[PDB]
Design an enzyme around this catalytic site. Structure first.
Site, PDB file in Angstrom:
ATOM      1  N   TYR A   1       1.754   5.362  -2.245  1.00 46.82           N
ATOM      2  CA  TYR A   1       2.033   6.732  -1.782  1.00 46.82           C
ATOM      3  C   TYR A   1       3.446   7.149  -2.081  1.00 46.82           C
TER       4      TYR A   1
ATOM      5  N   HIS B   1      -9.975   1.903 -10.857  1.00 44.50           N
ATOM      6  CA  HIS B   1      -9.431   2.774  -9.811  1.00 44.50           C
ATOM      7  C   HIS B   1      -7.941   3.128 -10.049  1.00 44.50           C
ATOM      8  N   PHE B   2      -7.079   2.130 -10.183  1.00 42.58           N
ATOM      9  CA  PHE B   2      -5.658   2.449 -10.184  1.00 42.58           C
ATOM     10  C   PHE B   2      -5.043   3.044 -11.459  1.00 42.58           C
ATOM     11  N   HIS B   3      -5.659   2.807 -12.610  1.00 41.96           N
ATOM     12  CA  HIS B   3      -5.247   3.546 -13.786  1.00 41.96           C
ATOM     13  C   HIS B   3      -5.443   5.055 -13.590  1.00 41.96           C
TER      14      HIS B   3
ATOM     15  N   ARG C   1     -10.701  -9.181 -12.758  1.00 42.59           N
ATOM     16  CA  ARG C   1      -9.493  -8.542 -13.213  1.00 42.59           C
ATOM     17  C   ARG C   1      -8.516  -9.680 -13.547  1.00 42.59           C
ATOM     18  N   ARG C   2      -7.350  -9.330 -14.077  1.00 47.07           N
ATOM     19  CA  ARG C   2      -6.306 -10.328 -14.442  1.00 47.07           C
ATOM     20  C   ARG C   2      -6.766 -11.518 -15.318  1.00 47.07           C
TER      21      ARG C   2
ATOM     22  N   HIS D   1       0.797  -1.210   0.000  1.00 44.99           N
ATOM     23  CA  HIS D   1       0.000   0.000   0.000  1.00 44.99           C
ATOM     24  C   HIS D   1       0.843   1.279   0.000  1.00 44.99           C
TER      25      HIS D   1
HETATM   26  C1  HAS Z   1      -0.585   6.139  -7.186  1.00 45.29           C
HETATM   27  C2  HAS Z   1      -1.554   5.004  -6.940  1.00 45.29           C
HETATM   28  C3  HAS Z   1      -2.640   4.918  -6.179  1.00 45.29           C
HETATM   29  C4  HAS Z   1      -3.237   5.808  -5.125  1.00 45.29           C
HETATM   30  C5  HAS Z   1      -2.764   7.213  -4.790  1.00 45.29           C
HETATM   31  C6  HAS Z   1      -4.165   5.078  -4.433  1.00 45.29           C
HETATM   32  C7  HAS Z   1      -5.299   5.648  -3.649  1.00 45.29           C
HETATM   33  C8  HAS Z   1      -6.056   5.003  -2.763  1.00 45.29           C
HETATM   34  N1  HAS Z   1      -6.347   3.692  -2.825  1.00 45.29           N
HETATM   35 FE1  HAS Z   1      -5.666   2.448  -4.257  1.00 45.29          FE
HETATM   36  N2  HAS Z   1      -6.901   1.060  -3.537  1.00 45.29           N
HETATM   37  C9  HAS Z   1      -7.583   1.088  -2.228  1.00 45.29           C
HETATM   38  C10 HAS Z   1      -7.795   2.364  -1.509  1.00 45.29           C
HETATM   39  C11 HAS Z   1      -7.383   3.517  -1.984  1.00 45.29           C
HETATM   40  C12 HAS Z   1      -7.657   4.743  -1.206  1.00 45.29           C
HETATM   41  C13 HAS Z   1      -8.619   4.873  -0.033  1.00 45.29           C
HETATM   42  C14 HAS Z   1      -6.840   5.693  -1.680  1.00 45.29           C
HETATM   43  C15 HAS Z   1      -6.876   7.183  -1.304  1.00 45.29           C
HETATM   44  O1  HAS Z   1      -5.581   7.576  -0.864  1.00 45.29           O
HETATM   45  C16 HAS Z   1      -7.329   8.198  -2.384  1.00 45.29           C
HETATM   46  C17 HAS Z   1      -7.601   9.628  -1.853  1.00 45.29           C
HETATM   47  C18 HAS Z   1      -7.707  10.746  -2.873  1.00 45.29           C
HETATM   48  C19 HAS Z   1      -8.763  11.542  -3.023  1.00 45.29           C
HETATM   49  C20 HAS Z   1      -9.886  11.639  -2.017  1.00 45.29           C
HETATM   50  C21 HAS Z   1      -8.897  12.408  -4.270  1.00 45.29           C
HETATM   51  C22 HAS Z   1      -8.620  13.901  -4.056  1.00 45.29           C
HETATM   52  C23 HAS Z   1      -8.590  14.612  -5.382  1.00 45.29           C
HETATM   53  C24 HAS Z   1      -7.615  15.384  -5.879  1.00 45.29           C
HETATM   54  C25 HAS Z   1      -6.276  15.691  -5.238  1.00 45.29           C
HETATM   55  C26 HAS Z   1      -7.847  16.047  -7.202  1.00 45.29           C
HETATM   56  C27 HAS Z   1      -8.380  17.471  -7.064  1.00 45.29           C
HETATM   57  C28 HAS Z   1      -8.245  18.147  -8.402  1.00 45.29           C
HETATM   58  C29 HAS Z   1      -7.806  19.359  -8.626  1.00 45.29           C
HETATM   59  C30 HAS Z   1      -7.265  20.250  -7.529  1.00 45.29           C
HETATM   60  C31 HAS Z   1      -7.894  19.868 -10.047  1.00 45.29           C
HETATM   61  C32 HAS Z   1      -8.804  21.091 -10.220  1.00 45.29           C
HETATM   62  C33 HAS Z   1      -8.307  21.975 -11.346  1.00 45.29           C
HETATM   63  C34 HAS Z   1      -9.054  22.465 -12.343  1.00 45.29           C
HETATM   64  C35 HAS Z   1      -8.442  23.188 -13.514  1.00 45.29           C
HETATM   65  C36 HAS Z   1     -10.569  22.372 -12.398  1.00 45.29           C
HETATM   66  C37 HAS Z   1      -8.063  -0.280  -1.831  1.00 45.29           C
HETATM   67  C38 HAS Z   1      -8.725  -0.628  -0.564  1.00 45.29           C
HETATM   68  O2  HAS Z   1      -8.883   0.136   0.368  1.00 45.29           O
HETATM   69  C39 HAS Z   1      -7.516  -1.159  -2.658  1.00 45.29           C
HETATM   70  C40 HAS Z   1      -7.870  -2.614  -2.756  1.00 45.29           C
HETATM   71  C41 HAS Z   1      -9.118  -2.873  -3.617  1.00 45.29           C
HETATM   72  C42 HAS Z   1      -9.203  -4.360  -3.870  1.00 45.29           C
HETATM   73  O3  HAS Z   1     -10.315  -5.036  -3.599  1.00 45.29           O
HETATM   74  O4  HAS Z   1      -8.203  -4.884  -4.318  1.00 45.29           O
HETATM   75  C43 HAS Z   1      -6.725  -0.391  -3.688  1.00 45.29           C
HETATM   76  C44 HAS Z   1      -5.806  -0.965  -4.715  1.00 45.29           C
HETATM   77  C45 HAS Z   1      -5.104  -0.254  -5.586  1.00 45.29           C
HETATM   78  C46 HAS Z   1      -4.132  -0.930  -6.515  1.00 45.29           C
HETATM   79  C47 HAS Z   1      -4.148  -2.353  -6.957  1.00 45.29           C
HETATM   80  C48 HAS Z   1      -3.359  -3.255  -6.034  1.00 45.29           C
HETATM   81  C49 HAS Z   1      -3.437  -4.598  -6.688  1.00 45.29           C
HETATM   82  O5  HAS Z   1      -2.900  -4.691  -7.790  1.00 45.29           O
HETATM   83  O6  HAS Z   1      -4.090  -5.581  -6.065  1.00 45.29           O
HETATM   84  C50 HAS Z   1      -3.269  -0.051  -6.911  1.00 45.29           C
HETATM   85  C51 HAS Z   1      -2.158  -0.224  -7.928  1.00 45.29           C
HETATM   86  C52 HAS Z   1      -3.763   1.229  -6.332  1.00 45.29           C
HETATM   87  C53 HAS Z   1      -3.096   2.346  -6.547  1.00 45.29           C
HETATM   88  C54 HAS Z   1      -3.331   3.643  -5.869  1.00 45.29           C
HETATM   89  N3  HAS Z   1      -4.278   3.804  -4.801  1.00 45.29           N
HETATM   90  N4  HAS Z   1      -4.909   1.092  -5.588  1.00 45.29           N
HETATM   91  C1  HEM Z   2      -0.957   2.562 -22.818  1.00 38.31           C
HETATM   92  C2  HEM Z   2      -1.578   2.649 -21.447  1.00 38.31           C
HETATM   93  C3  HEM Z   2      -1.903   1.550 -20.782  1.00 38.31           C
HETATM   94  C4  HEM Z   2      -3.124   0.720 -20.993  1.00 38.31           C
HETATM   95  C5  HEM Z   2      -4.064   0.868 -22.168  1.00 38.31           C
HETATM   96  C6  HEM Z   2      -3.317   0.030 -19.875  1.00 38.31           C
HETATM   97  C7  HEM Z   2      -4.480  -0.896 -19.681  1.00 38.31           C
HETATM   98  C8  HEM Z   2      -4.403  -1.864 -18.775  1.00 38.31           C
HETATM   99  C9  HEM Z   2      -5.470  -2.894 -18.595  1.00 38.31           C
HETATM  100  C10 HEM Z   2      -6.665  -3.010 -19.560  1.00 38.31           C
HETATM  101  C11 HEM Z   2      -5.237  -3.569 -17.425  1.00 38.31           C
HETATM  102  C12 HEM Z   2      -6.032  -4.700 -16.756  1.00 38.31           C
HETATM  103  C13 HEM Z   2      -5.436  -6.047 -17.219  1.00 38.31           C
HETATM  104  C14 HEM Z   2      -6.059  -7.250 -16.529  1.00 38.31           C
HETATM  105  O1  HEM Z   2      -6.641  -7.091 -15.338  1.00 38.31           O
HETATM  106  O2  HEM Z   2      -6.069  -8.373 -17.033  1.00 38.31           O
HETATM  107  C15 HEM Z   2      -3.965  -3.012 -16.865  1.00 38.31           C
HETATM  108  C16 HEM Z   2      -3.372  -3.451 -15.548  1.00 38.31           C
HETATM  109  C17 HEM Z   2      -2.355  -2.835 -14.958  1.00 38.31           C
HETATM  110  N1  HEM Z   2      -1.790  -1.643 -15.275  1.00 38.31           N
HETATM  111 FE1  HEM Z   2      -2.076  -0.690 -17.063  1.00 38.31          FE
HETATM  112  N2  HEM Z   2      -2.351   0.301 -18.959  1.00 38.31           N
HETATM  113  C18 HEM Z   2      -1.501   1.247 -19.384  1.00 38.31           C
HETATM  114  C19 HEM Z   2      -0.667   2.021 -18.712  1.00 38.31           C
HETATM  115  C20 HEM Z   2      -0.366   1.840 -17.277  1.00 38.31           C
HETATM  116  C21 HEM Z   2       0.615   2.489 -16.675  1.00 38.31           C
HETATM  117  C22 HEM Z   2       1.298   3.759 -17.138  1.00 38.31           C
HETATM  118  C23 HEM Z   2       0.749   1.827 -15.356  1.00 38.31           C
HETATM  119  C24 HEM Z   2       1.735   2.229 -14.322  1.00 38.31           C
HETATM  120  C25 HEM Z   2       2.220   3.453 -14.288  1.00 38.31           C
HETATM  121  C26 HEM Z   2      -0.119   0.810 -15.348  1.00 38.31           C
HETATM  122  C27 HEM Z   2      -0.155  -0.202 -14.261  1.00 38.31           C
HETATM  123  C28 HEM Z   2      -0.896  -1.305 -14.319  1.00 38.31           C
HETATM  124  C29 HEM Z   2      -0.920  -2.399 -13.279  1.00 38.31           C
HETATM  125  C30 HEM Z   2      -0.626  -2.180 -11.807  1.00 38.31           C
HETATM  126  C31 HEM Z   2      -1.627  -3.417 -13.793  1.00 38.31           C
HETATM  127  C32 HEM Z   2      -2.201  -4.585 -13.011  1.00 38.31           C
HETATM  128  C33 HEM Z   2      -1.507  -5.896 -13.341  1.00 38.31           C
HETATM  129  C34 HEM Z   2      -1.918  -6.988 -12.372  1.00 38.31           C
HETATM  130  O3  HEM Z   2      -3.189  -7.021 -12.001  1.00 38.31           O
HETATM  131  O4  HEM Z   2      -1.109  -7.844 -11.950  1.00 38.31           O
HETATM  132  N3  HEM Z   2      -0.928   0.910 -16.454  1.00 38.31           N
HETATM  133  N4  HEM Z   2      -3.549  -1.929 -17.732  1.00 38.31           N
HETATM  134 CU    CU Z   3      -3.682   0.034  -0.619  1.00 34.97          CU
END
Ligand code: HAS
Ligand code: HEM
Ligand code: CU
Ligand code: OLC
Ligand code: OLC
Ligand code: OLC
Ligand code: OLC
Ligand code: OLC
Ligand code: OLC
Ligand code: OLC
Ligand code: OLC
Ligand code: OLC
Ligand code: OLC
Ligand code: OLC
Ligand code: OLC
Ligand code: OLC
Ligand code: OLC
Ligand code: OLC
Ligand code: CUA
Lengths: 551, 31, 166
Positions: A229, A376-378, A441-442, A225
C-alpha cells in the site's frame, strides 16, 4: 539555474526519480528471462554471456524483486509523496533532511548491491531465515528503508508548519494523503525494523547462532503487506489529484479521496497473516480475523474504482463523449501521461480480483506459492504502479528539469506504455493459469522441462509476454535516455504549475477525518490488538535454528 | 446517472465474482 | 449540471459501496462455511510444537522413515514427514484411501513447501517447528508433492510422492 536556487526540492526529487528508474531498468532486465522460464524456455546461458556475474536463476530473481519491488517502488514513493505535498502548500521541504534521506537511500542501496552482485545474498526479496545472507545485505537494506523515516519527518514538518500558519483550516487534499500515508508507513515499518534489529543483523553479524523462522516471518509480514500500500498510494495520489486534469475533467470528490486514504491508514497493517495462512503455530482464529480485516482493506480500492471511474466519465462527457462508451473515446488517448495510469487501472480489475481470492483463508490453499501470486502482483505493482510512474515522465520530468518532451518522444511513450500494459496482461494470463495448474512460483522450471506437461498453453503466453516485454523494456531505456540526455532546455516548463485537478458537500466528515492524531492512535491500537496476542505467545516460545547457505 | 462508472464497477463485480466463485469451485474439487 | 452530476455520482457511489460491502460479507460467510467442513483439515494446527532440526534425523519420529506411518485411530494414520534439501522422506509416503491422514512435517535445514498436487494440501515447513495438517484421500493412485517455497539451488527439482492404496 536560478530555478533550483528557489526550488531546490526539484533537484532532490529528480534524484529520487532517476535512481528509481535506474533500479527499475536494471531490475527489469531479468524479467524477460524469467518470463521465458515460466514459458519453459531456458535463455539463461545467453544472459550469463551478457552479464557474467550472474551465477543462477535465483540470483537474478533476488536482484529482480529487491531492485524492482523494494528499491524503485520506495524511491518513487519518496519522490512523489514529498514533492507533491510541497508544491500544493507552496512550501520548502527541509532540504538538509531531504538530501540526508537521498544519501541514506543511495548508500544503503550501494551497500546491499555489493553482496547481491557477488552472489552472497541470494535469499529472495523476502530473505526468509534460515536462508542466511551477507550482513551487508541486511545492513544496506536496513539503511535504505530507514531513509523513509526521514521522509516521514520531512512531511510531518511541512504539515505542522502549515497548520501553524493556518489554525482551524483543514489539511489540503494532497498533503492529507501524504500525511496519513507516511504515518501508516511508520506503523507498518516497525515489523521489519524489529526483525532486522533484534534478529537479522545480530544473526548475520555472528552475534546469535540461530533465528526463529516463524517469528522472523511474522514480523516480516507485519511490514510487507502495508509496504504494498506504500507502493500503491503514490500512484493513487497522482490518479486522484492529477489524472482528472490530464483527462480533461475534475476530481469528483475530495471527501471520497480523503476517506479512501483514511481507510488505508487504519487497515493497511493489521493484516499480515494473510501471508501466513499456510504457516504452522498461528492460531486459525487469528487467521480468520486477518482474513476478514483483509477483505476490509479491499474497501478503499473498491471505493477508488468508483470515484476514479466517475472522474474519468466526467472528463469524457465534458469533452463531447455521449453514449455508454462515448466518454471513453472522448478521453486524451494521445497523452502518455493520461494513458499509463488508466491502462494500469484496467489491469487492477483482475489484480484486485486475485487479491480478494488470496485473502479468503481456505481459498489461499488453492493458490499459495504457485504462479498465481506473481500473476496477481504483476498486475498490481509491475503494471499499475510502474505505469503510473512511467506516465509522470511526461509531466513530472519537464516540471523538474525544464527539459521538453518532443512529439516523437510522446509517441514512443504511448508505445512503451501500451506494449508494457499488454505484455503484463499476457503474462498475467499465463501465470494465473499456470498457477491453477499447480506450477510453483520462484522456480527455474525450464530446467525441469518435463515436470509440468499440463501447463503447455499458459506457457506460450509466458513466452509471448517475455518477448513483448523485452521490447517494451528496450524502448523504455532508449526513451528515458533521449529525454534525460536531450539537448534543449526551456526553464518555463520548470516554472509551470503541476497539473493538479480542481474538485467539482460534507464539511463535517472532512473535519472528522482531519483529526489525524486520533486516527493515528486508532491505527496503532488496531495493530496491537491484531498482532500483540500472537507476537506475545511467539516471543515467549522462541526456537532459534541455525542458518544455511544453499546456493 | 453516471452510467459509464456503473459499467466499470459492473465489470469489476463480474471479474471478482468469476475469480472468487471459480477458485471456490476449485477448492471443493480438491477437498 | 456540474451541480447535478456531483449529486448523481455521490448517490450512486453510495449504492455501490453498500453492494460491494454486501458481496464482501457474503464471501466472509462462505469462508466460515468452509471452516465448518472436513475441507478445513488442511489449515495448519495453530499449536506450537517445537523440535530440534539438528537431531531430528538422529532421534525421534523422523529418524526412521520406514516407520513414519503410524495408525493413530480406527480410521486414522499419522505420517511423520521430513522435507529437506532436496526431497521428502519417506519416498514414497504410503497411505490407505479413505482414511484420515495427519501429516506432521518438519525440516532439518531451511524452509520448504509441502504442496500435494491435486489437493488442498499446501503448507510451509519451517525448521524447529512441526506443521500438522489433515486430509482424507478420496481417490487412489499417485499424487506428486511439489516444494513451492524457494529453498536454494535444488528447489526446481524437489519433488516427492504419495501413493494412496485402494
Ligand atoms: C502494489 C501491489 C499490490 C497491491 C495493491 C496488492 C493488493 C492486494 N493484495 Fe496482494 N496479495 C494478497 C491480497 C491482496 C488483496 C486483498 C489486495 C487488495 O487490496 C486489492 C483491492 C483492489 C481492488 C478490489 C481493485 C479495484 C479496481 C480498480 C481501482 C480499477 C478500476 C478501474 C478504473 C477506474 C478504470 C476504468 C477506466 C476506463 C477508461 C474504462 C494476499 C493474501 O491475502 C497475498 C498472499 C497470497 C499468497 O498465497 O502468497 C498477496 C501477495 C502479494 C505479493 C507477493 C508477496 C510475496 O512475494 O510473497 C505482492 C508483491 C502483492 C502485491 C500487491 N497486493 N500481493
Ligand atoms: C520486463 C517486465 C518484467 C517481467 C517480464 C517480469 C516477469 C516476472 C516473472 C516471470 C516472475 C516470476 C519469477 C518466479 O516466480 O520464479 C517475476 C517475479 C517478480 N517480479 Fe517481475 N517482471 C517484470 C517487471 C516487474 C516489475 C516492474 C516489478 C516491480 C515493480 C516486478 C516485481 C516482481 C517481484 C516481487 C517478483 C517476485 C520475486 C520473488 O518471488 O522473490 N516485476 N517477474
Ligand atoms: Cu499482503
Ligand atoms: C514489436 C514488439 C512485439 C513483437 C511480438 C512478436 C511475437 C513473437 C514472434 C512471433 C512470430 C512467430 C515466431 C515463432 C517461430 C519460432 C518458434 C520456435 O521455434 O519455438 C521456440 C523453441 O521451441 C524454443 O527453443
Ligand atoms: C560514504 C560516505 C560519503 C558521504 C558523501 C556525502 C556528500 C554530501 C553531498 C550533498 O548533497 O551535500 C552538499 C554539501 O553542502 C557539501 O557540498
Ligand atoms: C544496528 C543494529 C545492529 C544489531 C547489532 C546488535 C544489537 C544488540 C544485540 C546484542 C547482542 C545480544 C545477544 C545475546 O544476548 O545473545 C544471546 C545468546 O544467544 C544466549 O546464549
Ligand atoms: C559501518 C560499516 C560496517 C559495519 C561493521 C560490520 C562488520 C561485521 C563483520 C562480521 C562478519 O563478516 O561475520 C561473518 C560470520 O561468519 C557470520 O556468519
Ligand atoms: C471486524 C473484525 C471481525 C473479527 C473476527 C470475525 C470472525 C472471527 C471469529 C472466529 C474465527 C473462527 C476460527 C475457527 C477456525 C478453526 C478451524 C479448525 O478447526 O481447523 C481444523
Ligand atoms: C489475453 C488478454 C490479452 C488482450 C489484452 C486486451 C486487454 C484490454 C485492451 C484494451 C482495452 C482498452 C479500452 C479503451 C481503449 C481506448 C482507445 C480509444 O477508445 O481510442 C480513441 C480514439 O483513438 C480517438 O481518440
Ligand atoms: C491475436 C492477438 C494478438 C497478439 C498480441 C500481439 C502483441 C502486441 C501487438 C502490438 C500492439 C501495440 C498497441 C499500441 C497502441 C498505441 O500505441 O496506440 C495509442 C492509441 O492511439 C491510444 O493510446
Ligand atoms: C478491464 C479488463 C477486463 C478484466 C476482466 C477479465 C477477467 C477474466 C475472467 C475470467 C477468465 C477465465 C475464463 C472463464 C473460466 C473458464 C474455466 C475453464 O476453462 O475450466 C477449467 C477446466 O477444468 C480446465 O479444462
Ligand atoms: C492475446 C494473444 C493470444 C495468445 C496466444 C494464442 C494462443 C496460443 C495457444 C495455443 C497452444 C499451443 C500449444 O503449445 O499447444 C498445446 C499442446 O502442444 C497440444 O498438444
Ligand atoms: C505483429 C506482431 C504480433 C505477434 C504477436 C504474437 C501473436 C500471439 C501468438 C503467438 C506468438 C507466440 C510466440 C511463442 C514462441 C514459441 C512458443 C514455444 O516456445 O512453443 C513451445 C511448444 O508449445 C512445445 O514444444
Ligand atoms: C510526534 C509524532 C507525530 C504523530 C502524531 C500526529 C498528529 C498530531 O500530533 O497532530 C497535532 C498537530 O500537530 C496540530 O496541528
Ligand atoms: C486481463 C488479464 C488478467 C488475467 C486474469 C487471469 C484469468 C483467471 C480468471 C479466472 C479464474 C477463475 C477460476 C477458474 C477455475 C474454473 C474451474 C472450474 O469450473 O472448477 C470446477 C472443476 O471441477 C475444478 O477442477
Ligand atoms: C449474484 C449477485 C449478482 C451480481 C450481478 C451484478 C450486480 C450489479 C452490481 C452493482 C450495482 C451497484 C449500483 C448500486 C445502485 C443502487 C441504486 C442507487 O444508488 O440509486 C440512487 C438513485 O438516486 C436512485 O433513484
Ligand atoms: C438481497 C437478498 C438477500 C439474500 C442474500 C444472501 C446471499 C446468499 C449467498 C450465499 C449463501 C452461502 C450458502 C452456503 C452454501 C455453501 C455450500 C457449498 O457450496 O457446498 C459445497 C460442498 O460440496 C460441500 O462440502
Ligand atoms: C483465462 C484463464 C483460464 C484458466 C484455465 C483454468 C484451468 C484450471 C483447471 C483445473 C484446476 C482444478 C484441479 C482439479 C483437481 C483434480 C486433479 C487430479 O485428480 O489429478 C491428480 C490425481 O493424483 C490423479 O489420480
Ligand atoms: Cu524445498 Cu524449494
Amino acid at each position: 539555474s536560478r530555478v533550483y536556487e528557489a526550488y531546490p526540492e526539484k533537484k532532490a526529487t529528480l534524484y529520487f526519480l532517476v535512481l528509481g528508474f535506474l533500479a527499475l531498468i536494471v531490475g527489469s532486465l531479468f524479467g524477460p528471462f524469467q518470463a521465458l522460464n515460466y514459458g519453459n524456455v531456458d535463455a539463461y546461458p545467453l544472459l550469463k554471456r551478457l552479464l557474467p556475474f550472474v551465477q543462477s536463476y535465483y540470483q537474478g530473481l533476488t536482484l529482480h524483486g529487491v531492485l524492482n519491488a523494494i528499491v524503485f517502488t520506495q524511491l518513487f514513493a519518496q519522490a512523489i509523496m514529498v514533492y507533491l505535498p510541497a508544491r500544493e502548500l507552496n512550501m520548502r521541504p527541509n532540504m538538509g533532511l531531504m538530501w540526508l534521506s537521498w544519501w541514506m537511500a543511495f548508500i544503503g542501496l550501494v551497500v546491499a548491491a555489493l553482496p547481491l552482485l557477488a552472489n552472497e545474498a541470494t535469499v529472495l526479496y523476502t530473505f526468509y531465515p534460515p536462508l542466511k545472507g551477507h550482513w551487508a545485505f541486511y545492513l544496506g537494506a536496513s539503511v535504505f528503508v530507514l531513509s523513509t523515516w526521514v521522509s516521514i519527518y520531512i512531511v510531518l514538518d511541512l504539515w505542522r508548519r502549515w497548520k501553524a500558519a493556518n489554525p482551524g483550516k483543514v489539511t489540503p487534499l494532497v498533503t492529507y494523503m501524504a500525511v496519513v500515508f507516511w504515518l501508516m508507513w511508520f506503523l507498518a515499518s516497525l515489523g521489519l525494523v524489529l526483525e532486522a534489529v533484534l534478529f537479522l543483523l545480530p544473526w548475520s553479524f555472528g552475534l546469535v547462532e540461530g533465528v526463529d523462522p516463524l517469528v522472523a516471518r511474522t514480523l516480516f509480514w507485519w511490514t510487507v503487506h502495508p509496504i504494498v500500500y506504500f507502493w500503491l498510494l503514490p500512484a493513487y495520489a497522482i490518479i486522484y489529484t492529477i489524472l482528472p486534469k490530464q483527462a480533461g475533467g475534475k476530481l469528483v470528490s475530495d471527501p471520497m479521496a480523503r476517506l479512501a486514504f483514511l481507510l488505508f491508514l487504519l487497515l493497511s497493517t493489521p493484516v499480515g497473516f494473510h501471508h501466513q495462512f499456510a504457516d504452522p503455530g498461528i492460531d486459525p482464529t487469528w487467521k480468520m480475523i486477518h482474513s476478514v480485516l483483509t477483505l476490509f482493506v479491499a474497501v478503499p480500492s473498491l471505493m477508488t474504482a468508483f470515484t476514479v471511474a466517475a472522474s474519468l466519465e466526467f472528463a469524457g462527457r465534458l469533452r463531447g463523449g455521449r453514449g455508454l462508451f462515448g466518454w471513453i473515446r472522448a478521453l486524451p488517448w494521445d497523452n502518455p501521461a493520461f494513458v499509463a495510469p488508466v491502462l494500469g487501472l484496467l489491469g487492477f480489475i483482475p489484480g484486485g480480483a486475485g487479491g480478494i481470492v488470496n485473502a479468503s483463508f481456505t481459498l489461499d490453499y488453492v493458490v499459495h506459492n504457485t504462479a498465481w501470486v506473481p500473476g496477481h502482483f504483476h498486475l498490481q505493482v509491475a503494471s499499475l504502479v510502474t505505469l503510473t510512474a512511467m506516465g509522470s515522465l511526461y509531466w513530472l520530468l519537464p516540471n523538474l528539469t525544464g527539459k521538453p518532451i518532443s512529439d516523437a518522444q510522446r509517441r514512443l511513450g504511448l508505445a512503451v506504455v501500451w506494449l508494457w500494459f499488454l505484455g503484463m496482461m499476457i503474462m498475467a494470463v499465463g501465470l494465473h493459469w499456470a498457477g491453477l495448474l499447480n506450477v510453483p512460483r520462484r522456480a527455474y522450471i525450464a530446467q525441469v522441462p518435463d515436470a509440468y506437461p499440463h501447463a503447455a498453453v499458459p506457457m506460450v503466453f509466458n513466452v509471448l509476454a517475455g518477448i513483448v516485454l523485452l521490447v517494451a523494456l528496450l524502448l523504455f531505456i532508449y526513451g528515458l535516455f533521449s529525454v534525460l540526455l536531450s539537448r534543449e532546455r526551456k526553464p518555463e516548463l520548470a516554472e509551470a504549475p503541476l497539473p493538479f485537478a480542481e474538485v467539482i458537500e460534507d464539511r463535517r466528515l472532512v473535519l472528522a477525518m482531519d483529526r489525524i492524531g486520533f486516527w493515528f492512535a486508532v491505527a496503532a491500537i488496531l495493530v496491537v490488538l491484531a498482532y500483540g496476542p500472537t507476537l506475545v505467545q511467539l516471543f515467549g516460545h522462541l526456537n532459534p535454528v541455525p542458518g544455511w547457505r544453499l546456493w | 446517472k453516471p452510467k459509464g462508472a456503473l459499467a466499470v464497477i459492473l465489470v469489476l463485480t463480474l471479474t471478482i465474482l468469476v475469480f472468487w466463485l471459480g477458485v471456490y469451485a476449485v477448492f471443493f474439487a480438491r477437498g | 449540471d456540474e451541480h447535478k452530476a456531483h449529486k448523481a455520482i455521490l448517490a450512486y457511489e453510495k449504492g455501490w459501496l453498500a453492494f460491494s460491502l454486501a458481496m464482501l460479507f457474503v464471501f466472509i460467510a462462505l469462508i466460515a462455511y468452509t471452516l465448518a467442513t472436513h475441507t478445513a483439515g488442511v489449515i495448519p494446527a495453530g499449536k506450537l510444537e517445537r523440535v530440534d532440526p539438528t537431531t531430528v534425523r538422529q532421534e525421534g519420529p523422523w529418524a526412521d522413515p520406514a516407520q513414519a506411518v503410524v495408525q493413530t485411530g480406527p480410521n486414522q494414520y499419522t505420517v511423520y514427514v521430513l522435507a529437506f534439501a532436496f526431497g521428502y522422506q519417506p519416498n514414497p509416503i504410503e497411505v490407505p484411501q479413505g482414511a484420515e491422514i495427519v501429516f506432521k512435517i518438519t525440516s532439518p535445514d531451511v524452509i520448504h513447501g509441502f504442496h500435494v498436487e491435486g489437493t488442498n494440501i499446501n503448507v510451509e515447513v519451517l525448521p524447529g517447528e512441526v506443521s500438522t495438517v489433515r486430509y482424507t484421500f478420496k481417490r487412489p493412485g499417485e499424487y506428486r508433492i511439489i516444494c513451492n517455497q524457494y529453498c536454494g539451488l535444488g528447489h526446481q527439482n524437489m519433488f516427492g510422492t504419495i501413493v494412496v492404496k485402494e
